[PDB]
Structure formats: structure tokens, C-alpha cells
Amino acid sequence: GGWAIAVHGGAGVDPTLPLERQEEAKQLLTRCLNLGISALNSNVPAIDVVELVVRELETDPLFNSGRGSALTEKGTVEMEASIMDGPKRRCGAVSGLTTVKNPISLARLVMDKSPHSYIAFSGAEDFARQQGVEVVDNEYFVTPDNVGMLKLAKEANT
């Protein structure tokens, strides 16, 4: 065979999904898929392609990752991610990120540049800064829509 790629924006979709949001989601999926296809046609390695595509999915506020992440009960964002390169089964993962613009790229750096495969919370925030990645205030990741839903989730918890 030749190249193949899939992208996802999560399971658990409610069947009453508004058409308008269904269209936004397909348009985003298409954009991300095509971004990966473009890299694959340009002979970019698989490990670089999954990183570049998940970065786009992180940046767009629609799905639950990066900016647009679900909120904690405190109303803030704690993000996590993992990446794996198949040929030598190389792994990188991060949890508890609060300022890192693109969690998946920090997981990549754990894979390539740490003796460990998983770094989390304060140590992962330290590592991001040693590595010089883009970091921002947590409020950056928080969107009005998610504040709205957090409210609901809380009260629903009766």
C-alpha cells in the first residue's frame, strides 16, 4: 500500500447535534485531514504528520483539546496528550499542562528529548520552559462556550 491517515475529534456525539455544528465539525475535520494529506504527499514522516495535524486540532477551539478544552471544576484547563512513533515504539506523554499552547508537541519533545516517556504537572511546565515552547496564561485556553457548559455540568451534579 501507500499512505493512509485518519483524524478524530472525539466520540460521544449527541444525535441531536445541530446541523450548523455538524457542518463546522466536518469542515474542521476536512481541513485537518487535508493538512495531513498535503504533508504525506510531500513525503513528511508519519511521526511528523500526526504532530502537525493534532496541533491544528489543538489550535482550533471547536473540539476538546488545546484552546477550547473542557474545564476543570475550578473553571480552568488542564491538558494532556501522548504520541508514539511505531517503528521503534518511541513514546512521549504529558499531563497537567496549564500554559502550554500545543500539548502534543510537548509530548513529542518528551519522546525525543527526555530520558523519560511521561512528564506531568509542575515538572512538565518546567520542561516546556527548558525546551522554549510557546506558553500562555491559562485563560487563553478557556472559551465562553466551555464556561457555559461547566455551569450546567455542575448544577446537574445536584
Binding site: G12, L33, N43, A46, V50, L57, F63, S82
Partner: protein, 131 residues
């Protein structure tokens, strides 16, 4: 949760998954997305990214399971994904996307819907939410 799996022209597979986790979670809660073998796995023959109830994906080592079933039961990608979704998930709800080193691509899920898009070099392309 979002994710991407890719096999390139060299037959190398990779997988990536990223998430904000569950709404209203308490600080420090870790789901399946950053856990190798649960939310993400890739090896010689496949790359897999999972999404859904963290509880089910972790106890079912779901991403590793696609690879284990390819390796130990000899199932090809599409049937291995079928097997994992059918036999490995109990009351739990999850889905996954996967590619094989031979350039196939698959998605499977046992809930109402899953946002995904898939493509192969020969020209197949699908963008889907529902069955």
C-alpha cells in the same frame, strides 16, 4: 479528545492524541489520552488513537489491543478493530481510529457518533460523524 493516526509511504505508523479531559473534572484527574497502550499506541503494524470513556479504554488497554489482536490472532486491521470494539468493550463506550503498515485505515466505535475523517493515497476519503 482529538487524535490522528498516519502510515506514510515508508510504511511507518504513528499515533497522537490530545485532550482537555472530562468537563467538571477535579484537578489531577488523568484519563486515557496520555496513557500509552490506552489512548495511543503505534508499532510495526499499526497506529491507533482512542476516544471515549477513560475508564473503559484504560481497563481494556484499547489502543494496544488493536495491535495485540493483529499480532496474536492474525487479524487484519479492519477485522481487528471490529474485534476490539465488539469483544473488548463491555458496558463502556469508546471508539478509535487506526492505520496499518500496509496502508489501510479503519475507525470503529460503539456509541452514537464519533467525529472522524479518513483517507488513503489511492483516493478514498470519508468524513463522518454517524454510522
Amino acid at each position: 479528545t482529538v487524535g490522528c493516526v498516519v502510515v506514510d509511504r515508508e510504511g511507518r505508523c504513528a499515533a497522537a492524541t490530545s485532550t482537555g479531559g472530562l468537563m467538571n473534572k477535579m484537578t489531577g484527574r488523568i484519563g486515557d489520552s496520555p496513557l500509552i497502550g490506552a489512548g495511543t499506541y503505534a508499532c510495526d503494524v499499526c497506529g491507533v488513537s482512542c476516544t471515549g470513556e477513560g475508564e473503559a479504554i484504560i481497563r481494556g488497554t484499547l489502543a494496544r489491543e488493536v495491535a495485540a489482536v493483529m499480532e496474536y490472532k492474525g487479524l487484519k486491521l479492519h477485522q481487528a478493530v471490529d474485534f476490539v470494539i465488539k469483544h473488548r468493550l463491555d458496558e463502556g463506550k469508546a471508539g478509535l481510529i487506526a492505520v496499518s503498515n500496509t496502508g489501510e485505515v479503519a475507525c470503529g466505535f460503539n456509541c452514537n457518533g464519533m467525529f472522524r475523517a479518513c483517507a488513503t493515497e489511492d483516493g478514498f476519503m470519508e468524513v463522518a460523524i454517524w454510522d
